[PDB]
Design an enzyme around this catalytic site. Structure first.
Site, short mmCIF file in Angstrom:
data_model
loop_
_atom_site.label_atom_id
_atom_site.label_comp_id
_atom_site.label_asym_id
_atom_site.label_seq_id
_atom_site.Cartn_x
_atom_site.Cartn_y
_atom_site.Cartn_z
N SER A 1 41.21 3.29 31.77
CA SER A 1 41.43 4.35 32.75
C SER A 1 41.54 3.83 34.18
O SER A 1 41.96 4.58 35.06
CB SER A 1 40.32 5.40 32.66
OG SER A 1 40.25 5.97 31.36
N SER B 1 42.66 7.89 32.59
CA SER B 1 42.11 9.14 33.12
C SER B 1 42.13 9.20 34.65
O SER B 1 42.06 10.30 35.20
CB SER B 1 40.69 9.35 32.60
OG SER B 1 39.77 8.47 33.23
N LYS C 1 37.62 9.75 42.37
CA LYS C 1 37.84 10.40 41.09
C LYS C 1 36.88 11.57 40.91
O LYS C 1 35.73 11.54 41.36
CB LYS C 1 37.65 9.39 39.95
CG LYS C 1 38.09 9.89 38.59
CD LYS C 1 37.89 8.82 37.55
CE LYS C 1 38.35 9.28 36.21
NZ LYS C 1 38.06 8.26 35.19
#
Lengths: 6, 564
Positions: B184, B160, B82
């Site tokens: 997320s 996210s 990420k």
């Protein structure tokens, strides 16, 4: 929706 | 061919000479260039930052192997991380324009463990600015779904890690790294048929990870199978001597066991067949399977947004849960429909049920400190620890550019986020207090753990439950939820805007394990099954999920990304 409790 | 190949089959091909680390890197890049890059028919936009040293690191992997000295089981295994992860040499914007030029001066702990093991990072995945949302477009935009272009690849409001979910499901790498503050991590994994594990507090160090809410941020690994996820945890899970940034490993008020004390000897040994489910008692909250009419029957339910309201699960999702329950019962397990005080006592969704704001276990002033003063320090201390000479202070950040609104899209429902994120820069200019001098922290942290003891730990004991199960999400929002009013209502409803559990799951340090529950027959969208349990019972939950995965073939290859 993202920060802590709010 | 690397499409839907496991880590064991890749390591097997690396040891037999059928392939090399460099050839694996090129195979994954061919799928990124064919399905992820702009100008392609799909243009999924999952991988947003490339690692130019991937081939150089892959050549070093083959050099170590040709010399009969592999670094371990993950030597030469590509992966993605990420954009919140610090990867040395690459940018760390957190999907935010204000940090688009921020350069990672070092690696995150999870990246440091993988690099030492010979794993190579192919690049970074997409995310909304500062992970403060789900499917909102950041500096790199947003990732699209590889299963159905008409629906989002993650919950719109809390998801996210949308790039990490898309990239892993489309075999743009062997596995992926994500992060979760609300949902997320569990969110994107559900919409992409992935296995995900949210550990208990302090199990995986968050040093080097862009924080959002230090009391709730956790590292979340992604994998297409339970076997692959255990391969990852066997390397990343280890004690971290540097506790900077990790609030729960710094605080002395609440005891937190070391990672080496919580982890098993061998994570891959936790895999088991259906025998691990025999004689077990699993509780499913009625509120997540269209069986709780009392949800939302109080005077003023919720604590903001669609919280505390009745959840309408999609019928195609109910059908998959019914087959999932049948598989559990056929393996000798007991599924019980129960309440879920962990959510009800947090959101006050029924008469008599308190909320986190009025229950009195944590003060109202702490909840204020938890989202203002404590998070502003998290942003500032992260920039100070990274030490980029061009940008190492939150006060020197372009406030209005942290999270600018996407023009043409529907306004945010929770509230304005452009001025809200700029406020953190205002606080940094007036003075930020560090974590250890915030007066409300000692009582708040002890109150959070006490809340889990009453609502979950003692609750599961008196119910004799081994774990708590439920569909990860109730439904998926259409892809045009950012501009279509009709789609926004669907995407912003309870159980859809955020994976089931809302904030209480991450707020109270609850470990979870998510596995694919199947694919919806109507819209072809995957939906997951989440296993939750007592704190630091992670090995049992991982074993339960591995056992459930063995009883069916509930994952398909994304139709938008077939093998080349």
């Amino acid at each position: 929706p993202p920060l802590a409790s709010k | 061919e690397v499409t839907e190949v496991s880590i064991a089959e890749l390591r097997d091909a690396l040891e037999s000479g059928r392939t090399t680390a460099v050839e694996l890197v090129q195979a994954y890049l061919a799928r990124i260039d064919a399905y992820d890059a702009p100008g392609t028919p799909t243009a999924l936009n999952a991988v947003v930052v490339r690692n130019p040293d991937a081939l150089a690191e892959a050549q070093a992997s083959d050099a170590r192997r040709a010399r009969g000295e592999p670094l371990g089981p993950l030597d030469g295994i590509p992966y993605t991380a990420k954009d919140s992860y610090l990867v040395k040499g690459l940018t760390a914007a957190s999907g935010s324009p204000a940090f688009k030029d921020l350069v990672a001066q070092r690696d995150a702990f999870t990246v440091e463990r993988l690099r030492a093991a010979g794993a190579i990072c192919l690049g970074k995945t997409n995310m909304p600015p500062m992970a403060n949302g789900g499917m909102q477009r950041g500096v790199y935009g947003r990732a699209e779904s590889p299963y159905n272009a008409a629906y989002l690849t993650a919950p719109f409001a809390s998801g996210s890690s949308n790039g990490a979910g898309t990239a892993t499901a489309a075999s743009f790498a062997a596995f992926g790294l994500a992060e979760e503050t609300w949902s997320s991590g569990r969110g994107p994994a559900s919409n992409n048929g992935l296995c995900a594990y949210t550990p208990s507090r302090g199990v995986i160090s968050v040093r080097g990870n862009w924080p959002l809410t230090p009391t709730m941020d956790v590292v979340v690994p992604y994998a297409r199978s339970m076997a692959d996820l255990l391969e990852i945890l066997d390397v990343v899970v280890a004690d971290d001597p540097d506790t900077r940034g990790d609030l729960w490993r710094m605080q002395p008020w609440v005891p937190i066991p070391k990672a080496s004390e919580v982890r098993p000897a061998s994570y891959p040994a936790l895999a088991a067949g259906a025998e691990a489910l025999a004689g077990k008692r699993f509780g499913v909250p009625r509120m997540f399977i269209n069986a709780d009419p009392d949800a939302g029957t109080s005077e003023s339910p919720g604590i903001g947004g669609p919280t505390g309201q009745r959840i309408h699960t999609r019928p195609s999702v109910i059908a998959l849960w019914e087959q999932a329950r049948k598989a559990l019962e056929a393996a000798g397990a007991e599924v019980i429909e129960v309440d879920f005080p962990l959510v009800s006592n947090c959101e006050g969704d029924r008469p008599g049920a308190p909320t986190v704001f009025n229950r009195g276990l944590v003060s109202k002033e702490f909840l204020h400190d938890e989202l203002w003063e404590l998070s502003a320090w998290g942003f500032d201390d992260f920039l100070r620890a990274n030490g980029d000479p061009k940008l190492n202070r939150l006060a020197d950040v372009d406030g209005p550019q942290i999270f600018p609104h996407d023009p043409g899209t529907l306004p945010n429902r929770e509230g304005d986020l452009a001025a809200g994120m700029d406020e953190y820069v205002r606080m940094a200019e007036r003075g930020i207090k560090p974590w250890d001098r915030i007066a409300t922290l000692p009582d708040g942290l002890r109150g959070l753990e006490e809340t889990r003891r009453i609502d979950l730990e003692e609750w599961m004991r008196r119910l004799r439950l081994d774990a708590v199960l439920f569909p990860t999400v109730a439904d998926v929002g259409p892809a045009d939820a950012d501009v279509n009013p009709a789609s926004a209502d669907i995407a912003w409803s309870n159980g859809v805007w955020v994976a089931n559990g809302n904030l209480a799951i991450r707020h109270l340090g609850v470990p979870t394990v998510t596995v694919p529950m199947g694919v919806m027959a109507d819209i072809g969208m995957p939906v997951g099954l989440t296993f939750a349990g007592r704190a630091y019972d992670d090995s049992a939950l991982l074993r339960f999920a591995a056992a459930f995965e063995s009883t069916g073939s509930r994952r398909i290859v994304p139709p938008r990304t077939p093998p080349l």
